[PDB]
RNA sequence: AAAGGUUUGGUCCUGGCCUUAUAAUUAAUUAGAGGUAAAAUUACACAUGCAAACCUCCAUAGACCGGUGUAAAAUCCCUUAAACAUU
């Protein structure tokens, strides 16, 4: 489901511009899924330390 | 605050990270609500996303931004 | 269904305009404000009534009538009801959202409760937070003390009905009780000490009579403007009487007799007036003073 | 001198010279040689109309011409001629004024 | 203007600066080197976390 | 120490049409005959800032201070009214009339809140409804169909309540931070419970 | 008194009184006009009334004059496409040119009524901040609100001052 | 200043005097300065109750979502209150925090129940 | 500026200086407390302490915040192009 607030600004859009639904405002997650905080990172990417000892 | 390159602190090189200690429970609860939490918020950001490209495009060529281009010209 | 009139029907405009009246004196009297010095033009009688002209174009939008609506039905919607927040704050939030090209009756302004629930803001939440982020010059955040009972009576007393209600138009919404109950208080008043003149020429006396007709009180309005010789409106007035009463025994009696001009007043006064003799008289009285003078 | 005439509301700036005399003799010549608005109806035989802005565009008649009213009516120019004081005009350009300029006075 | 002239000493120092660094690369024996007894990166002096130990 | 008592102090109002007070001032305001004492042409920009201390009057009372029976009330209108320019309804600044800035002060409250009470007139502009528009057809101000979750009494979204983990992931946890582990806590009390008083 | 003859043309009000913003394409108008004729009056008072108008509202348009150098007084305009556009003011009133140019050439009010809505889209009327760019600088300035602390005092129990006393006491 | 880096923020700028709290919601890159330079302002948040007993919250929904769809990161505090307004969905740790306050209230209405309990004993002993 | 004082034996003109208003700093004399804002001789030299970390190693950050007015007529506004140590 939409956020409360933002699920009832929807249904009031529908509702102004004629449309008139019952249907439920629905979030779709498929296209933005978050991979594993482990998962391996792009090492080609990555920063090298500096070549200055301490 | 500091630059990198200032000299650190004599009263600080003793120290060591404390890590805060897990409850099992409640840390795996968490864990969970991030995850399911953040993919809804990038399901929002992405819907945001395309509202504001969808406005920009009819701005710049939508119907009504057409005629009123060859409006001007006729 | 014949539809019931409405105050802004073209029809009841026109009537209401013709009674309430002009004078460009007392639509146009001064301001008390601060002062700047006087210009001055040399104009032929052409020019004069020219501008006379303007004047009264002027006065006319100077005079349109503020809406008339019935009572707003309060707001009580309840968006959600999340129980974890329960406890975890002690003060309500209210959140509305501030962008500009949203009409005010359209924004959503909602409150979360401490006890959890999103709901939607009443119609005073409304309105407060409205006029604190979409200030509106004349209006304030919280309701004036002049609209006590005792204050407006005092205004009553010093004959300042017409700013008692420029003051409701410029504070209260016009569907809000606060705003119909100090317009119904104020034409109240003009009523019991037959004030009438005090809104004439003014954009309240539409509502004014629009009310008295509603609530079946046009005798007192009727005596007056047969007394001040404005006998076309008080048959304009019993038009209007007889157009958002269709089926009162006085619009029944008119049609069967086809009474036109003083006939309607004279129907009035003996069908459904609550004081049809003093209606005959102030009416006999004026026929009499016109018959004998001219 | 302005009490003792009546007058109650009035700005005036006096520069050059502040000899006392001409100054006094400056002022009654100027007051006493002004055209009242019933002499400049029937000078130009127009009406004269006032407009003030606390009365809206509601026209004020202050004075009718006392013969025959004229039907031609007086030129109006789209560019005036008329010679402007800087002082005055300086005010309304948007130029900073003097710290002296309308302080806090008693009442006159 | 006219008046800002050429900096030719900072440009040497920022093209000096790049060869020394180019040449004198680092390497992976020397920037991961640890110390066992303390647990601490030599070339930096780096500490590792104590979750790591 | 002692300072007169007036016989209006209950009823300021009568003072002003007493017969003592038309002698002492006609019908003109009661600020006509003061003049301040001043070096230069230009006056001060503020007047004095009071002119009674600790019972002590000061050397030129300003025509509040000078008559101790003019009182500054809101009920007092008549008075407030010669502290209020009739033309344009702006109320004088101190120099103007030569109070001093503590009865100055005294008397603009005073005037606001005759005004407020309508015992004090002024000007009313006329101004048009805030709103084109009067309808309340709109969802923001209209009941917006109860959701789902709403009606069942569920929360809106799943991981708003509280989820037993599965026995293995718990497991994994205290294999992963063996050492440093907290007491494992169960499903947390149903509602807040009531505050302890 | 102010120098020059019709000292009235210089004065902000005078110059802005003009009503001809010309449309984007417009680059340059050159004036040809004659010091010295009877059909060429119009064009000698359109420069000296109206020029200073045109200049005003349209700053980054080269107005350049020449004199004397045709029969006939003409206005040319160049465009941003390349187009040169003739005008012919012999015989013509300085107003007669000045609508004529305003017709052809010139902005009609509703377009700019739309871009004076646009420029302020950014200005809104709750956003709080300094007084060049907001109404109210502070939420303590609304009525109903908690009134700034220099103004009123705060509560005892609203300080951090007493607050951290309690806690040393506890 | 010329930053180098960073990214676009909706963040919470303090304002208002000692003891007064009042925040402005606005856009800003995040390396500037807290009450500095910012981009747009999106809002404003009075903390402190009014005389109705309303913390009163403003935003701009337009161009909040305006700027999240560009980039725009929120700042935690600002999450918080997209969450309370029902905007976003509540925030993991508010849900969270939420708990851990039933959890220490219970202890402490146990706690009570026991004292008093050891004050009945007290009560037997007389 | 709504102006005033001041050349002469006197009058008038010209013309400067000064006064009356407003503020900042320092100083003399004087003073109870409370709320608030501000804090400022010097780009002269500095004892001492602190101001940058985080974190399952890699990285990231310490390029910001903060400070001063050194230099330079140095700038403003605008156009074009490309990037970023970014999202
Ligand atoms: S300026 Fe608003 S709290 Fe002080
Ligand atoms: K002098
Ligand atoms: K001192
Ligand atoms: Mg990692
Ligand atoms: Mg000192
Ligand atoms: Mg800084
Ligand atoms: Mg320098
Ligand atoms: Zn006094």
Redesign the interface.
């Given at each position: 489901?939409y956020?409360?607030?933002?699920?009832?600004?929807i249904?009031?859009e529908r509702?102004?511009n004629g449309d008139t639904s019952?249907q439920?405002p629905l979030?779709?997650?498929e296209?933005?899924?978050?991979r594993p905080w482990d998962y391996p990172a792009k090492q080609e990417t990555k920063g090298?330390?500096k070549?200055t000892?301490? | 605050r500091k630059t990198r390159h200032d000299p650190p602190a004599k009263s600080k090189v003793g120290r060591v990270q404390t890590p805060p200690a897990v409850d099992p429970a409640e840390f795996f609860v968490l864990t969970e609500r991030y995850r399911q939490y953040r993919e809804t918020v990038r399901a929002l950001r992405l819907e945001f996303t395309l509202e504001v490209r969808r406005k920009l495009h009819e701005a710049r060529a939508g119907v009504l931004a057409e005629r009123k281009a060859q409006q001007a010209i006729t | 269904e014949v539809k019931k009139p409405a105050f802004m029907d073209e029809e009841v405009q026109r009537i209401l305009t013709k009674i309430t009246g002009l004078d460009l004196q007392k639509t146009f009297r001064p301001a008390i404000q601060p002062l700047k010095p006087p210009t001055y033009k040399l104009m032929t009688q052409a020019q004069l009534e020219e501008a006379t002209r303007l004047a009264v174009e002027a006065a006319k939008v100077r005079l349109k009538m503020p809406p008339v609506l019935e009572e707003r039905k309060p707001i009580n919607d309840v968006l959600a009801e999340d129980k974890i927040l329960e406890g975890t704050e002690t003060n309500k939030y209210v959140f509305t959202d501030i962008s500009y090209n949203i009409p005010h009756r359209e924004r959503f302004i909602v409150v979360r409760e401490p006890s959890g629930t999103l709901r939607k803001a009443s119609w005073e939440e409304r309105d407060r937070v409205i006029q604190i982020y979409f200030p509106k010059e004349g209006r304030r955040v919280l309701p004036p003390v002049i609209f006590k009972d005792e204050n407006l009576k005092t205004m009553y007393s010093q004959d300042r009905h017409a700013d008692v209600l420029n003051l409701c138009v410029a504070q209260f919404e016009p569907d809000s009780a606060e705003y119909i109950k100090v317009h119904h208080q104020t034409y109240e008043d003009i009523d019991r000490h037959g004030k009438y003149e005090l809104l004439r020429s003014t954009r309240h006396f539409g509502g004014m009579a629009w009310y008295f007709v509603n609530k079946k009180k046009i005798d007192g309005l009727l005596i007056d403007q047969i007394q001040r010789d404005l006998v076309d409106d008080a048959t304009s007035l019993v038009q209007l009487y007889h157009m958002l009463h269709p089926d009162g025994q006085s619009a029944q009696e008119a049609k069967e007799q086809a009474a036109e001009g003083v006939d309607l007043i004279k129907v009035f006064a003996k069908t459904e007036a609550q004081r049809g003799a003093y209606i005959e008289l102030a009416l006999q009285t004026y026929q009499e003073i016109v018959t004998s003078h001219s | 001198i302005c009490r003792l005439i009546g007058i109650k509301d009035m700005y005036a700036r006096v520069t050059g010279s502040m000899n006392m005399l001409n100054l006094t003799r400056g002022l009654f010549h100027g007051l006493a040689r002004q055209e009242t608005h019933q002499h400049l109806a029937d000078k130009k035989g127009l009406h004269v109309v006032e407009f003030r802005e606390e009365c809206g565009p509601l026209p004020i008649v202050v004075a009718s011409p006392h013969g025959a009213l004229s039907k031609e009516p007086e030129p109006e120019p789209e560019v005036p001629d008329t010679k402007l004081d800087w002082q005055d005009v300086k005010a309304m350009q948007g130029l900073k004024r003097s710290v002296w300029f309308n302080l806090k006075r008693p009442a006159t | 203007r006219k008046k800002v002239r050429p900096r030719l000493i900072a440009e040497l120092a920022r093209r000096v600066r790049a060869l020394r660094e180019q040449r004198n690369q680092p390497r992976d024996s020397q920037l991961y080197a640890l110390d066992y007894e303390t647990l601490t990166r030599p070339h930096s002096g780096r500490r590792l976390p104590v979750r790591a130990w | 120490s002692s300072l007169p008592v007036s016989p209006y102090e209950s009823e300021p109002w009568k003072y002003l049409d007493s017969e003592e007070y038309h002698n002492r001032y006609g019908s003109r305001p009661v600020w006509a005959d003061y003049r301040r004492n001043h070096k230069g042409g230009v006056p001060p920009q503020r007047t004095r800032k009071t002119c009674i201390r600790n019972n002590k009057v000061a050397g030129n009372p300003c025509p509040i201070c000078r008559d101790h029976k003019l009182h500054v009330d809101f009920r007092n209108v008549k008075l407030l009214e010669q502290f209020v320019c009739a033309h344009t309804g702006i109320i004088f600044h101190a120099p103007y009339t030569g109070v001093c800035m503590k009865q100055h002060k005294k008397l603009t409250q005073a005037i606001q809140k005759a005004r407020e009470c309508g015992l004090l007139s002024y000007y009313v502009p006329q101004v048009e409804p805030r709103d084109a528009d009067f309808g309340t057809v709109h969802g923001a101000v209209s009941v917006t169909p109860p959701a789902p979750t709403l009606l069942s009494g569920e929360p809106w979204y799943p991981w708003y309540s509280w989820q037993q983990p599965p026995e293995r992931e718990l497991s994994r946890l205290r294999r992963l931070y063996q050492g440093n582990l907290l007491e494992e806590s169960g499903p947390p009390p149903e509602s807040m419970p009531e505050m302890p008083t | 008194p102010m120098k020059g003859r019709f000292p009235i043309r210089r004065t902000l009000q005078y110059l802005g009184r003009g009503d001809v913003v010309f449309k984007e394409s417009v680059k340059i108008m050159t004036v040809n006009y004659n010091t010295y004729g009877e059909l060429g009056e119009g064009a000698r008072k359109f420069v000296f009334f109206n020029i200073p108008q045109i200049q005003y509202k349209n700053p980054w348009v080269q107005i350049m004059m020449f004199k004397n150098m045709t029969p006939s007084p003409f206005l040319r305009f160049y465009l941003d496409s390349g187009e040169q556009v003739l005008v012919d003011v012999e015989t013509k009133s300085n107003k007669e040119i000045m609508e004529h140019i305003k017709k052809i050439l010139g902005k009609k009010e509703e377009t700019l009524r739309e871009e004076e809505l646009e420029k302020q889209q950014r200005f809104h009327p709750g956003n709080f901040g300094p007084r060049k760019y907001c109404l109210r600088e502070c939420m303590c300035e609304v009525e109903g609100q908690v009134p700034c602390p220099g103004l009123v005092p705060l509560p005892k129990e609203m300080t951090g001052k007493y607050k951290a006393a309690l806690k040393a006491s506890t | 200043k010329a930053y180098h880096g960073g990214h676009l923020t909706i963040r919470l700028a303090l304002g208002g005097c000692t003891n007064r709290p009042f925040y402005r919601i606005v856009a800003a890159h995040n390396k500037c300065p807290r009450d500095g330079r910012f981009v747009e302002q999106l809002g404003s948040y009075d903390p402190l109750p009014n005389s109705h007993g309303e913390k009163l919250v403003a935003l701009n929904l337009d161009r909040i979502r305006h700027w999240i769809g560009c980039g725009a990161h929120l700042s935690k505090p600002m999450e918080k209150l997209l969450g309370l307004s029902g905007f976003f969905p509540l925030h993991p740790m508010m849900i969270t925090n939420a708990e851990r306050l039933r959890r220490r209230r219970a202890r402490e209405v146990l706690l009570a129940s026991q004292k008093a309990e050891s004050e009945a004993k007290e009560t037997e002993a007389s």
């Open positions: 489901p956020p409360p607030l933002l699920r009832a600004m249904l009031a509702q102004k019952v439920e979030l779709n997650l296209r933005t899924r978050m090298r330390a070549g000892p301490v | - | - | - | - | - | - | -």
